[PDB]
Amino acid sequence: MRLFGYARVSTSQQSLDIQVRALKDAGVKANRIFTDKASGSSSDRKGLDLLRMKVEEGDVILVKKLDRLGRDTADMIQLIKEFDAQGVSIRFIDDGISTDGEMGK
């Protein structure tokens, strides 16, 4: 089990630093900070891209709320269904627990 934290910058000053402090404050290790330097030529979705292959069985993925996971398509729910099937959890600073309620009821 480990404390992985997903991050993504939105501003063009030092959002990666502010994000990391947000994941660490949430309970994430600096060594496990899969951030995303979106402040570039295009969106750098490499954090969850590598997180899907770096999380361990029974690991907790702490996500911060600075902008938004996805936008239109089920992106925020995509990596959530991928980790949910891998036996991994995803904590949310917005509440403290994971998506305890994401089905097509």
For this PDB entry, the determination method is NMR
- In the block, tokens 């501003």 appear at 11
19-36 in b/e form (b: 16+ CB < 10 A) is bbebbeebebeeebbbbb
Of residues 10, 15, 42, 89, which has the active-site annotation? 10
Question: What are residue 26's phi and psi, to 5 degrees?
Answer: -70, -35
Active site residue 41: no
- Give the pair of three-digit tokens for residue 88: 């991994």
Indicate the burial class of 76 (C-beta count within 10 angstroms; 0-12, 13-18, 19 or more).
Answer: middle
List phi, psi (to 5°) of 62.
-80, 120
Annotated domain spans of the chain: 1-105
CATH architecture of 1-105: 3-Layer(aba) Sandwich (3.40)
- Token pair 């600073």 is found at 93
Distance CA 35, CA 81 (A): 20
Judged by DSSP in three states, 34 sits in strand
Is the Cβ–Cβ distance between 88 and 56 less than 8 Å? yes
